[PDB]
Amino acid sequence: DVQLVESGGGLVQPGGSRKLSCSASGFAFSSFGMHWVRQAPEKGLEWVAYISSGSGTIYYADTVKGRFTISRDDPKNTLFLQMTSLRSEDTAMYYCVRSIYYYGSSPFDFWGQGTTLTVSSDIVMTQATSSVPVTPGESVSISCRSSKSLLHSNGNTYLYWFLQRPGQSPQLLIYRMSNLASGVPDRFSGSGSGTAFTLTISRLEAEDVGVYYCMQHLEYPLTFGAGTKLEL
Amino acid sequence: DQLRQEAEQLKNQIRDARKACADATLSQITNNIDPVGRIQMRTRRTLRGHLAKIYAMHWGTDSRLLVSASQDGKLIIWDSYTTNKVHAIPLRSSWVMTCAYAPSGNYVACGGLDNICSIYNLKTREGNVRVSRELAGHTGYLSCCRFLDDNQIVTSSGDTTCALWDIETGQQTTTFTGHTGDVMSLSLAPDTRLFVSGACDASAKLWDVREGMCRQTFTGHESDINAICFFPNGNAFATGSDDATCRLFDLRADQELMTYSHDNIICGITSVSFSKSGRLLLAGYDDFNCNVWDALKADRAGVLAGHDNRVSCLGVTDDGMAVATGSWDSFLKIWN
Amino acid sequence: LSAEDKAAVERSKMIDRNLREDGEKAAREVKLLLLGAGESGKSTIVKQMKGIVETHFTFKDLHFKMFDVGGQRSERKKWIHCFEGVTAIIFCVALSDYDLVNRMHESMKLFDSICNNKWFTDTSIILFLNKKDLFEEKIKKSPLTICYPEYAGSNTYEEAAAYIQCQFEDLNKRKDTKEIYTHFTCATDTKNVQFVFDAVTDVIIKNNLKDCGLF
Amino acid sequence: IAQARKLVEQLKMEANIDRIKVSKAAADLMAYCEAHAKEDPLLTPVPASENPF
Amino acid sequence: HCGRAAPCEPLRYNVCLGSVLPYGATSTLLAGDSDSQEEAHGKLVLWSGLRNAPRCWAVIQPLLCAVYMPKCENDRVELPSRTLCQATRGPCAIVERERGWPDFLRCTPDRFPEGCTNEVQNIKFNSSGQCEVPLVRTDNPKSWYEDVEGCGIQCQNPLFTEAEHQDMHSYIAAFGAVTGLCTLFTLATFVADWRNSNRYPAVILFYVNACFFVGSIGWLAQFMDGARREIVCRADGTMRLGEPTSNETLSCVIIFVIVYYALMAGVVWFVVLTYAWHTSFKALGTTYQPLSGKTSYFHLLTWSLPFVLTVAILAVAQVDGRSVSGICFVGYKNYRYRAGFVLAPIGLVLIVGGYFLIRGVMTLFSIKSNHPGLLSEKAASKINETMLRLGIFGFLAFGFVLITFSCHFYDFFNQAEWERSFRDYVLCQANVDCEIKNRPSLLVEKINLFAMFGTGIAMSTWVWT
Ligand SMILES: CC(C)CCC[C@@H](C)[C@H]1CC[C@H]2[C@@H]3CC=C4C[C@@H](O)CC[C@]4(C)[C@H]3CC[C@]12C
């Protein structure tokens, strides 16, 4: 089936270098805009790098601008990241996620298992809520606040909701604030308006706890929220 | 042995019965209604991807995505708002004579000159589109395919037999066999409860999608009929013919109601599709224009002339926002 | 635009490029519609070379395609317009078919309907007078008068075959646009594919010079 | 002859149907047609705001 | 300090050629040239030939009848101050180039003292206006006969007579009309079957013919009511130079850019055609059309190269008007600019065209021996035709470039001889008959026009089937 796994982790002394290789297998690699998003040991997710279909377009996060190099090999189905002059601030897990961009698509619909790499005018998503405990069976509403009119001239609002299960790779829940993902229970629903959003999860049960990041996708670099850790 | 005389007897009785119930001549009743003035539609977008003649299109129920199947051996799924292409489905058989789009927006059914309405899958994992099924069984050629639901697809073959298929297994569940010559066009009902198939021997029959008993049989045309479409009410349907006479039949009256014919027209019809209101009937001609017939008074109300070669397909969206004409130029315009 | 619509337009351009490239690679191959009456010997020539059946063979660095559509009984006048823009029309005729029953007149009438058809006006018609050996043996038994009552000439194979050929090459109402090439199937040689090549290269040269605006 | 037997069978099955007056059927088509003349961006050219083409 | 004791005599001529002398004594000692009153008047009537160039005549007349007719006050001769000399040195230096100012006119600190009494301010000869048959009164140093100030050479070219002009005009009109009709017939043929004849190398040929048609109607912007009198002819009544000027209207810059762009696009399009033919003929058979994917780059290059060239001609400002041809074209006064910008491009065109054309003919000659099969008899006829069709055209296209080069170097040869003799004529006209040594023959101009419109014609012969 669809399976993203990468390798080349371990520890590197600061000012060193590494090449992280994401080995995509089970789908068509050539047509998928692949991303790179990291996570500091106990912080929320950040956007790092980007590669489009056929390497016709590349972007970078301002934190690593020109300091990293992303590259892909279509015929082998592999995605490389050349990183040089590593500071002590790049210590994180490094997920390679697929994103397909056409009309009615589901970008970020799969996330790789992720490898740890330890060392020795942007939109800001002010997720105000941090931790709320809820009992299995009730309804709870999470909050996400944008810093910019997200209802674009197209008519749709580019705001995604990711659930990260404890010690897992976070999957997509809802894309463009309303639509459900592929293979998600119907309990989940999104609502709201421009610059004010919620994920009103219904009849919460077990195997459903974790953190909920609201990755606004309207502009580049993509910025995530702090995340709301659901405790039992 | 001699039952041909009794068949003639019953045919005369039918003609007598449907005749003795005609007192309107719709053109007489419609005398009061004011005309639609004059409507001129400006080409909004020119969707240009194909490198050969295009033979079909079908507006997905989204009223945004249209699928246009060409003779290049590639049907592409357009995006009518931004002119963007979202798929380039490379079909196995180069020859294509029809195209469908399942109302859910998941499936899209090709089908061409080698008897296999071959359905595709769009909303899948893995990105690329696969061949879910290849519905073989026909001994002529596929002329139209249309979707009931994501499971059931009717077909209109060149074996004189419209067949309802079951995608799940890939076998003809029912075979509707009444016609004499080819079946050139087919159209479902807004309730999907009974469809009509326009044959190639100037007989448009109304089938029943469930049982398979041709409840009625309409005649009036002298030559082949190449297009059918239901009045959005579902108690009337146009026929496009090679006589140049787009005739509005009725389902309950059992007879022809009026005829759309201009004595300066000679070329045949290729497509017909009512507007959402059902007021104005479109028709795709071989004079390289698609005239817009007022479907109440038989008077022409406009001309949509932007095509170099003949128009093959004409699809009207499910909210009347925009019609689209598929020429042989490899450009399909979107009028409004 | 937006962040997503940019990537959408990039996908649009990418598959548009792929579509145009496949267009080039598809236009590089010459097409050959294969007509032929019922039991005309389409099997003979189709096996000599290498619903609808699409046979791909290569010779002298040209990729040919033959659509032996004859394996289909439907309204010809409904699907034949699918083939306008084909290079030539390989129209095999059974030459042993002068004896059976009317069958020669049937084949001639199909040639007449396919050679003066609205869509084929420019397409140069090859025709293969196949199974010449059986016709060559058969003339000594029954004269050509059986099927051509008006025929007035020698009952020798060589002149009889030439009369049949001329009788077909007469059919075309339009003579200046579409030249009708002819060959008898040399069973013990490879001159069948060679003649197909010579026919197609001629019509290609003529089309390609008419393209240059000189002719 | 079985073809002709099935033909006349189908004709007999088709014969006994309630034909309605073309007057009422025409009036019904005119009624439905005129009643839905407000929701048709081809009859009533909607201003350039709503029309996204 | 401007007073010398010298003997004078009572005057006998009291006239300064249009005014009275308000005194009753004259000297001649200041005038080194003349000795007595009779020789003084002799020299006065000899210098009187400066009636022409009024801006110098009006300012010299004081000096003329002051230096020759000064005043003596009890044997005291007055020598003029710096003002009178310095007035007629720089802006009126016609004499030094013509004859040379003798020792008497070259004002020395002894012969012309510095800032003393002049007394010449009493008499003013303001009203003087004279510009002879080849001259017209002008008031801007730009549009003058640079050598002779005040006046300017008139709008009609003085070398050729009105009869010669009318003969040229009848010829250009007739030949422009023939080319116009021929090219318009070709455009009519191409529009007749459009989208069946929109196949590309034929479309290139259509563009060539359309471009030369626009050029030919450009040449016939004259022959209206008085279109020549607004196009070639300036507002004052002189010939037009330095085309884009802050004062003067854009009357013939437009008719220049039309003809020049038309021509240059025409000849470049021809080169692109020849390339298209070579590339096509290389792939005669094999159903592979290589020039299918580079149509845009043809368009961009062929349309843009004349654009940058014509803007470069408007940048450096040399395009001017000619009375006979009746069309403003680049560089008539300066050989260099016309030479470069009209013969370098046609040079390039001929060489590239010639190479590609010979390569194409060699290709479709070899086509038989390099064809693995055998050519059908009907085909070999059509190839051997289209081979002779380029040959004749390949030779004819050489002639039409070799004619113009012969006609130009003829101009560049004696352009020095004409500018001299023409100047010598108006001087010989300034003396008073005497005629021009050699006037440019209209034959070479007729043959130049023939070369142009011949090239316009040859590109229209292919549609003759
Ligand atoms: C394209 C090739 C084969 C032919 C082009 C050559 C001809 C058309 C070009 C090349 C040089 C050009 C000439 C050079 C300059 C002059 C002098 C001017 O006072 C009249 C126009 C005239 C005479 C030009 C007319 C057009 C011209 C003759």
Question: How would you describe the overall organization of this protein?
Answer:
The complex is a heteropentamer of chains A (232), B (336), C (215), D (53) and E (465). Chain A is built from no helices and 19 strands. In chain A, the strands form 5 sheets. In chain A, strands 2, 4, 5, 8, 9 and 10 form a 6-stranded mixed sheet that branches. Chain A has a 4-stranded antiparallel sheet with strand order 1-3-7-6, with no helix packed on it. Chain A has strands at residues 3-7, 10-12, 17-25, 33-39, 45-51, 68-73, 78-84, 92-99, 110-111, 115-119, 131-133, 140-144, 161-164, 171-175, 179-180, 191-193, 196-201, 211-213, 229-231. In chain A, strand 6 and strand 7 form a beta hairpin. Chain A folds into 2 domains: 1-120, no CATH class; 121-226, no CATH class. Chain A is globular. Helix content of chain C is 44%, strand content 16%. Chain C has a 6-stranded mixed sheet, with helices on both faces. Chain C is elongated, with a radius of gyration of 21 Å. Helices cover 53% and strands 0% of the residues of chain D. Chain E folds into 2 domains: 3-105 and 114-130, Frizzled cysteine-rich domain (Orthogonal Bundle), CATH 1.10.2000; 152-458, Up-down Bundle (Rhopdopsin 7-helix transmembrane proteins), CATH 1.20.1070.10. Chain E has 12 helices and 4 strands; from the N terminus they run E-H-H-E-H-H-E-E-H-H-H-H-H-H-H-H. In chain E, helix 5 (162-192) packs antiparallel against helix 6 and helix 8 runs parallel beside helix 10 (335-366). Chains A and C meet through loops of A and helix 1 of C. Cholesterol (CLR) binds at residues 263, 267, 270, 325, 329, 342, 346, 349, 397, 400-401, 404, 448, 451-452, 455 of chain E. Residues 263, 267, 270, 325, 329, 342, 346, 349, 397, 400-401, 404, 448, 451-452, 455 of chain E line the site of cholesterol. The PDB classes it as membrane protein. The entry lists the keywords GPCR, membrane protein. It forms a pentameric assembly. The entry is titled "Structure of human SMO-D384R complex with Gi".
